[PDB]
C-alpha cells in the first residue's frame, strides 16, 4: 500500500510532468445567481478596502484637510442630478456587501442551506441593496 | 422521418499529444437513441466513431462512473435527459479543471487520495470485541447519517467548487469533507475529536466560502454545503 | 493547537462587530466609534485580503512577499485613519459633510 | 519486444474489487499475506455498489429464527441442484458475517431496540417450510450494497494491500495444472504486467450482458469465467440464469423485491393480483423463476398493460408515504427518472429482466477451484473463486433474494481462511517461464489492429439478440437449436472484426473488443448447455421437457422404486469446455453434494416436489 500523502504527491509529480492537458473550467461552467453574488461579495469587499486605504492615504499625503476639499467640491454647484448618481454609486458596493455578509453569517449559524432558500435570500438580499442605496442616495 | 440532434464534444488523445484539444460534432437521430445523454454517447460510439472514450458503468446513476460536464454543469450521463430542442447544439466537456487522461476521462487519483486520508470507517477506543455481536443503534442516531451516506463519490460537486480548482492540492473538497462529516456523527464511532483536529490548518477545511456550487449540482441531491457549515460550527465550539 | 478554528470564530466576531458600528456610528458619532471603526476596518480588512491571498497567491516566495506587502499596507491604512481622527473631523462627521454635498 | 513487460511479485493476488473481491484481499493483508488486488474499475464502481434488497442473515432481531431454516429455504430455492455442505456453511456463518459488517460501520437500518431491521423477502419461512413468511433480510433502506460496498472499501484503506487499479485481467499464468498469477493490462498506460503470486483468487462478477436487457452493469462481461475456460478448465450450470421478476420496462433498471416484501403485489391489465392464483401461499414473494414464469404466461395469454400489452404492473400505492420514504427511497427516485412514475399514486411497469448467473467458476465449499477427472473432483492448485464468477454451489438452479451479497462476504473471507491454513506469507513465489503470457499480448495487439469486416458492436447486439430470443424464460428444443447454431456463426465472424481506435491508452475500443470475446466464450456454454439438458428445474424451463427429473421420482414413495443411473436422470451439475480456436462445446456431468458438514448438528434436506 501507499499513504494518502505519498498518493498525493505522486499524482502531482506525474501530472505536472505530463503532455495531459487542465480540462475547461471558468470558460466553461453555467453561471447560477449565488454563484455571481458569491464572487460580487468578494469583489465588493476588495473594492472598500481599497477605498478605505486610499482614503486613509490621502489624509496623510493631501496638502489641505477634508472640509477644504468638501468646500470646493460644492462651489461648483454641480447638477444634483448628477451628485445624487453619484452617491448611489459610493454606497452601493457597501450597501451589497452589508446585506450580503449578513446573509453568511446566517449561513455560519448554519441556517438558510436549501437550494430554494438560497435562492430566495439572494433576491432578498439584491432587492433589500437597491431599495437600501435609492434611499439613502436621496438624503 | 427523423430527429437529429447535435452534440459538440471534447476530445484529446494521449497518444497523439501534439495534436491540441477540440470539439467534434455529431448528429443523432432521437428516434433511435435511448432518453439520457450518455444513451447519445453509447449509440454515437457504436455507430459514428468507436475511438470516443469515456468512463460508464451501471446505467443506473448509483456507481459515480460518467460524471462529465453536460450543458455547463456537471452532472451523470446517465440520468441527463437529452434536450430535445433540435435547433441547440449541447456541449460535453470533462469534470472542470481536472488533468484529462483521454477524451471524458479525467484523474480522479488525488479526490482518492484525500478521501483516504480522512480515514473514512468506524473507531471505537476498544476494537478487541469487534464481530461478537451487532452493536446498538437507536432509530432517531440513525436518521443523523440520512442526506450523508448515500454519496455515490463521483466528484460532481468537488470539481464544480472554484475553491476546489485553485487549491485542490490542499483543499479537502465538498465529498471528502460531507465524508468526515458523516464519521463525526456516526454514534458508535469514538473519534470525533481527532476527526476535527485534523482540520485545523488554513486549507483543508477553510477555503470553502459558501460558493454552493456544489449543493446545485449533486445528481443525488444531497447538500455538502450544509455539511461544511456544520463541521465549521463543531470546531468552533468543541474541547 | 486550535489556531484556525480560532481565527475563523475571530473573523466572525469582528465582522458582527463592524454591523454594530454601522448604527452606532448614526446613533452616537463621536471619538469612541471613531476609533472603533478605524480598528474593525482595518482589521476585517486585513483578514479578508488575507482569505483572498492565500485563496489566489502560489508559491512559497510569492505567498511571504505578498502577506508582508499585507502587513505594510494594513500599518499605513490604521495609522492615517488614526491621524485622520485625530487631527481633522474623524471618520463619522467626514461621512456627515461627504453627504451634505 | 513490442511490449515491455513489468513482473510483480506478491504472496496473493486478488481479481475483483466487488464486495467477494475486497473481503477476500483485505481477509488476506489481514493474515499478514503481502497481496494484490487487481481491478478494471476503481472498486466503489463494482456491480455490487447497485445492490437494494438486503442480505440474509438468522439474526433473530424480528421474531424469533434459526439459521438452519435459512439453510433449508435455500436448498428448496436451488431445486437440489445446491450443494449442501456449501449452503450448510454459508448460513451458519450468516449472523456472524452481517455482524462484523455492522461492526466496520455498515449503516443498517434500525428496529426500537436499536438492532438490524430485516424485511420480508422471497421464499423465505419459519420451522422448515411449515411456519409462515421469515423478515431475516438484513437491509440499509433500499441501498443495501451501495453501503456494503462503501464500508468494505473504507476498512481496505486499513491494511497494507496493494491495488492496481484500471488493470484489464487477460488470462491465468498456468504451468502444470497450477495457478501461478495472472498477467493484465494496465488501461492507464498502455503497459503489460504479469502478477505472479502462489496463490490467485478470481472474483470478477457476472456475464448479465450477453443479453440485449439485462439489470447488469455494462461491465458484467464474464472476464475471470472466460479466462478459466482459455485455461482448459470447466465453468459450471451456465446454463441457469436468472431472470429477476421485476426489471423496469424499458430501461432494465432493476426494482427491489423489497417493494414486494414490504408490501407492495404485481397486478395485470385487469386490474388482479394474479399471484394469488399462481403461488396460493406464497403469492407475490414465491421464488423468482415461479414469478418470472408466472408473469410471462400473464402477458403470453393477452394481460399485459400498456399500448404494447407488453409489461405488468407493481403496485405501491396503498402503501402509507412515510413507510416508502423510509424503506424504499432509492426505488422511489428510480421509478420518476426512468418511468416518470410517482409511486404514492401510480403503479411502476415492470418486466421480467436477465439479472444474476447462478453458474460460473466450480469451487468446493472452501473456495478452492476444482475441475472433474475420472468421476472425481479435484483442487486446482494455487486457484480459488468467489462471489457471482463462482458456483460453489450455494444457490443451484435458483437463488434465493439476498443470498449473493451474503455469498459474497462468507466466501471471500473463506477463500483468505483457507490460503492462511495452507500456506505461510513469504514462501517462495512460483517460477513461470519468460515468455509466459505472450499468446494473451499475440491477441490483445490481434484485436488493436483488426481491418475486418463487422464491428465490435455489430457483432455484439447479434450476439444479445439471438440470446434474447432463443434463451428466455421459457424454453424449446428447436429454438434452442436454432440460437446455437446463430452464435456458433457469429463466434466464427469473429474472425472478421473491424476496430478503428489505434492507440493504448484508454482503448476502450480495444477493451469493449476483448469483453465481446469474453462474453461470447460465456454465451456459448450457457445455451448449448440449455440445449442438452431436457428437463426443467429452477430458472431452466423446457416446454418440451416440463418436469424435473431427479434419481428417483420424489412424487411417490420411494419403497420398491428402482434407481435412475446418473446417465439418465438430471439432477447433476452440467461442466461446459470450449475449445477456443473453433468455438466447439464438450459438456460432462458431475454428482450434486447433498451431505451436510454435520449430519447431526444440520441434516441433510432429500429432494421434495417443490411449490410455493
Ligand atoms: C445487478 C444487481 C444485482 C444484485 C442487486 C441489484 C442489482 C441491480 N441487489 C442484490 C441484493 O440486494 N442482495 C443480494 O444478495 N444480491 C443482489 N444482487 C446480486 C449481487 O449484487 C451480485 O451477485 C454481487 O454484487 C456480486 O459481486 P461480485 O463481488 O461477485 O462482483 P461485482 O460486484 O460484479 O464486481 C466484479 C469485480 O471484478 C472486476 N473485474 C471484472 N472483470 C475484470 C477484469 N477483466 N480484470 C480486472 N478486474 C475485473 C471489476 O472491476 C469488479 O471490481
Ligand atoms: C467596510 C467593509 C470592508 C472594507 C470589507 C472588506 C471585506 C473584504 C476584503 C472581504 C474579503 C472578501 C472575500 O474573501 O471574498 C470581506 C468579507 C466579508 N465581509 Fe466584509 N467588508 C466590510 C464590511 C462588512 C460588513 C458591514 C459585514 C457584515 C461584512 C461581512 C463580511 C463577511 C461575512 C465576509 C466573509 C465572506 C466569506 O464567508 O467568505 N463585511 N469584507
Ligand atoms: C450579469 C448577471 C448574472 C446573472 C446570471 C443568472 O443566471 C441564471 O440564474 C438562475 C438562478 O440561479 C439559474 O436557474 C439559471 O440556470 C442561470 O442561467
Ligand atoms: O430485488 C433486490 O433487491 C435483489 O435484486 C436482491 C437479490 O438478491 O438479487
Ligand atoms: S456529494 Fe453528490 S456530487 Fe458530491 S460526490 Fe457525493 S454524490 Fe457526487
Ligand atoms: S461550492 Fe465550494 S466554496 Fe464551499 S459551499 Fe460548496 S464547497
Ligand atoms: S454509469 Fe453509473 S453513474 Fe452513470
Ligand atoms: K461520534
Ligand atoms: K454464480
Known sequence: ?139 | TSRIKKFSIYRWDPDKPGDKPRMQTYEVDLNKCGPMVLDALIKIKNELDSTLTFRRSCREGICGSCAMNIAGGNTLACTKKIDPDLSKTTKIYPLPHMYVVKDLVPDLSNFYAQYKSIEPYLKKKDESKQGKEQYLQSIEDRQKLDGLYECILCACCSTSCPSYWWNGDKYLGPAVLMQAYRWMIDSRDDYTEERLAQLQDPFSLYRCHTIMNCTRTCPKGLNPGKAIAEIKKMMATYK | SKAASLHWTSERAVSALLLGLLPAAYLYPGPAVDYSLAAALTLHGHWGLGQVITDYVHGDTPIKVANTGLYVLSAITFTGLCYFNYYDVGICKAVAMLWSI | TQYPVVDHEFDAVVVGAGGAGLRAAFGLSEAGFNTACVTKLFPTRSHTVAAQGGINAALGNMEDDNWRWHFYDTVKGSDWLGDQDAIHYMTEQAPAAVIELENYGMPFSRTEEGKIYQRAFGGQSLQFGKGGQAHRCCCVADRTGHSLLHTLYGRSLRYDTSYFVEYFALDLLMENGECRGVIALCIEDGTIHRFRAKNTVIATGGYGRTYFSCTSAHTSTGDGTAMVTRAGLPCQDLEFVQFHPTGIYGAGCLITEGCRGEGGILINSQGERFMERYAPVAKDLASRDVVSRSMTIEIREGRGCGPEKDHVYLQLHHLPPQQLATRLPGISETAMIFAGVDVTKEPIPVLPTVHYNMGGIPTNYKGQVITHVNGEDKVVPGLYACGEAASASVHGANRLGANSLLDLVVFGRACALTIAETCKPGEPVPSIKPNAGEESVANLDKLRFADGTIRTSEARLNMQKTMQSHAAVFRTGSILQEGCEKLSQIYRDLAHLKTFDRGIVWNTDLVETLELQNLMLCALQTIYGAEARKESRGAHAREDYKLRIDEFDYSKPLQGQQKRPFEEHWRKHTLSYVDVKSGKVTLKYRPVIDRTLNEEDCSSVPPAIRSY
Not at chain 1, 455560519?108 to 431599495?131: N, R
Open chain 1, 1 to 139: 500500500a501507499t499513504t494518502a500523502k505519498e498518493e498525493m504527491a505522486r499524482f502531482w509529480e506525474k501530472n505536472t510532468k505530463s503532455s495531459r492537458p487542465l480540462s475547461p473550467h471558468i470558460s466553461i461552467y453555467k453561471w447560477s445567481l449565488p454563484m455571481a453574488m458569491s464572487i460580487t461579495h468578494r469583489g465588493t469587499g476588495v473594492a472598500l478596502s481599497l477605498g478605505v486605504s486610499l482614503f486613509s492615504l490621502a489624509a496623510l499625503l493631501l496638502p489641505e484637510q477634508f472640509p477644504h476639499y468638501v468646500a470646493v467640491v460644492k462651489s461648483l454647484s454641480l447638477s444634483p442630478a448628477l451628485i445624487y448618481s453619484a452617491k448611489f454609486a459610493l454606497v452601493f458596493p457597501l450597501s451589497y456587501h452589508t446585506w450580503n455578509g449578513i446573509r453568511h453569517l446566517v449561513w455560519d449559524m448554519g441556517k438558510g442551506f436549501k437550494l430554494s432558500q438560497v435562492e430566495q435570500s439572494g433576491v432578498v438580499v439584491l432587492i433589500l441593496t437597491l431599495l437600501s442605496s435609492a434611499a439613502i442616495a436621496s438624503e
